[PDB]
Design an enzyme around this catalytic site. Sequence first.
Site, PDB file in Angstrom:
ATOM      1  N   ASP B  23     -41.421  -2.546 -14.706  1.00  0.00           N
ATOM      2  CA  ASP B  23     -42.201  -1.565 -15.359  1.00  0.00           C
ATOM      3  C   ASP B  23     -42.064  -1.588 -17.168  1.00  0.00           C
ATOM      4  OD1 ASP B  23     -43.714   0.701 -14.431  1.00  0.00           O
ATOM      5  OD2 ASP B  23     -42.644   1.790 -15.946  1.00  0.00           O
ATOM      6  N   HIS B  56     -42.812   6.019 -18.642  1.00  0.00           N
ATOM      7  CA  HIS B  56     -43.239   5.597 -17.369  1.00  0.00           C
ATOM      8  C   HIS B  56     -41.968   5.263 -16.530  1.00  0.00           C
ATOM      9  CE1 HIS B  56     -45.683   3.368 -14.571  1.00  0.00           C
ATOM     10  NE2 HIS B  56     -46.412   4.501 -14.269  1.00  0.00           N
ATOM     11  N   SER B 216     -48.223   4.921  -8.818  1.00  0.00           N
ATOM     12  CA  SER B 216     -46.856   4.411  -9.518  1.00  0.00           C
ATOM     13  C   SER B 216     -45.870   5.461  -8.804  1.00  0.00           C
ATOM     14  CB  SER B 216     -46.912   4.565 -10.717  1.00  0.00           C
ATOM     15  OG  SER B 216     -47.261   3.413 -11.471  1.00  0.00           O
TER      16      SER B 216
END
Lengths: 92, 481
Positions: B23, B56, B216
Site C-alpha cells: 500500500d 491509507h 480496502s
Amino acid sequence: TATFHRCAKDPWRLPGTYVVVLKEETHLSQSERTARRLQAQAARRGYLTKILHVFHGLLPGFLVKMSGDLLELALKLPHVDYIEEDSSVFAQ
Amino acid sequence: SIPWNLERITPPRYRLVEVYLLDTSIQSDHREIEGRVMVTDFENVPEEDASKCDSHGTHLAGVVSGRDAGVAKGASMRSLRVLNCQGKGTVSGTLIGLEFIRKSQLVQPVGPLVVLLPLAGGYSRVLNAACQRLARAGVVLVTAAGNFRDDACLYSPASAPEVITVGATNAQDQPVTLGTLGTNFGRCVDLFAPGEDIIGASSDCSTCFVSQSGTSQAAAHVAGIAAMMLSAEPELTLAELRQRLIHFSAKDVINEAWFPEDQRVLTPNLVAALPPSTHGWQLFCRTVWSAHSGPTRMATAIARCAPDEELLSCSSFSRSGKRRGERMEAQGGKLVCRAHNAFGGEGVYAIARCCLLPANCSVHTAPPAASMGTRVHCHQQGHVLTGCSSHWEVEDLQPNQCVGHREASIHASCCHAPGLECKVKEHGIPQEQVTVACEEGWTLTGCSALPSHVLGAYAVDNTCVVRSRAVTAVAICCRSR
Ligand SMILES: COc1cc2c(cc1Oc1ccc(C(=O)O)c(F)c1)[C@@](C)(CC(=O)Nc1nccs1)NCC2
C-alpha cells in the site's frame, strides 16, 4: 503466437513502459539475454531503451522503457509469451 | 465501546501467520501497531502530480492488527510501499512488490502468509498471472473488490481466480455507496465485509483515530480473519480457507436491490465473520458461476472448481431461457461444467457446485432415449448421487437416479463416499421462481429443475432456485454421518 495487451481504461494507461512476459519455464539467464537482444535490435534501428527490472521468482520476463514502435519487433523475440503496456493502480 | 465492524464479524457463539501489506507508506510508530509492523520500505511508486502520504496504509495496518481497533490484534505485519502520496501505483510496481514477497519467503521461510492488496487497476493479464503464481507457491492473497460500483471481474487483482476478493457493506448490511463511488460486485467477489465508517489508526498523530470507508477496509477485515483462521489451522489449503470464510459468513443479509438486476444472483450474499471456535469433518460446498458464454448461436460457458475441489453438480441459466442445457464432462482428470446456448441467444451461464470431499467421483451419461424419458443411475452399492445435468442438441422441445427429457442426454455425478448421507428434496408449485432448501446441518450438493419452460436453476447457499417464464425445484442434500 505472442500477443500484446493494454489497459481497457484509457486514462489509466502508461504508454512507453511494457512488461515483457516470457514462457513459463524461461530461465533468468534467458530473460536477461532476451532483454539484451531487444536493446541491441532497438539500438541498430536508432531507438534508446532502458531495462528497468528483470523479473524472476513468480513470472519470467522484464520491464522495459521504450517507444511502442518496437512492439512488433519485441513480439518476435524468443521465449516471449505476451507483452503488456504498464498501467495505473489505485488505493481502494 | 466496540466499533460496529468488530461486533459485526463476531459470530453468534464465541470464546504464527504474517500479513504482508502492499500500500502507501505507513506510520510504523503509531501506538496501534508499534513493534508489530516491519516496514521493508521497498519502494516502487510513480511521481506525485507525511500524515497525508501514510494515511491509507496506516489505517489498513490498524484495521488488520491494531491493539485496540484491529481484527487480528497484535498480528505481525510487513509493509511494502507500492502507492505514492496520492494513493497511486503501477501494475509493474505491484509485480515487483509481489516478487519481493516471494524472494523474501525463499530466503527466510516462515509459516503461512496472507498478502493484503487494497488496490485496483483495470483487468491485467500479467497482474492476474503473478497473483496465480504467488497463490500456487502457497500464499493467501486478499484483495479489495474496487470502489467503482461495477463488476469486479473488470479489475485486477480483484478478478484473479486464485485471490479472495472482498466487497464493502455498511452497519445496515447494505453495499457501500458514496456518490459516484461504491462497492464493486459480481461473480468475482468472494464475500463482503464491513467497509463503511471503519475506525482505525490515523497517521496525523501516534494515538489519533480516523473513520474511513472502502473495499480496502473490507479486505483488511478478511485479511485479519484469514490470518486468525490460518493461525488456528495452519494446514488449511487456500481452497479450504475460502470454503470456511463462505461457511462462517452471515448469509442473505444484504439487500440486493442495490445491485444491477443481472448482477444480483451472481453476487454472493455473504458478510464475513470469525468462526465460532478456533477448531469433526463437515461437508463444505460453494457455487461457482462461469463468465457469460457470449451471443453466439453455438456459444458455450465453462465452470470449473478451484484446485483440490470436487465438482459435484452442474446447472445452467439464461435470462431469456433460450438454452440447450448443460453437461458434466471430464477434462485433465477433473470434471467441468459446460452450458450450451440456443438459436435466439443472448448467451448462458454454467453454474457449478464445488465441494471439499477428500471419496471417488465419476460421471454416468445416457444419450437421448421413449415415453419413459432419458434416465441414468448410480448402479453401484455404497454410491451417492450428488448431482443431475441434462443437455439437448435439438433447437426446441427414484433414489440415485437422474431423469431428463426424451430428446436430451442425462448426466449423473456419482460418488463413493461412505461417510456421506444424501437425500433428494423436491418442491413443485403451479410462478417466476420456485425454491427448495436443505435443512440446517445439511449441505446442498446439487440443484436442478424436474423435466413448463425454465430459464435455469442455481444454488444460493443451501437453497436450490429454479426460474421460469407445474414447475419443480430438485435439491440434493448431503451431510457427514
Ligand atoms: C475470473 O473468474 C473468477 C474470478 C474470481 C473468482 C471466481 C471467478 O470465477 C471463476 C474462476 C475460474 C474458473 C475456471 O474455470 O477456472 C471459473 F469457472 C469461474 C473468485 C470468487 C474466487 C474463485 O471462486 N476462484 C476460482 N478459481 C477456480 C474456480 S472458482 N474471487 C476471485 C476472483
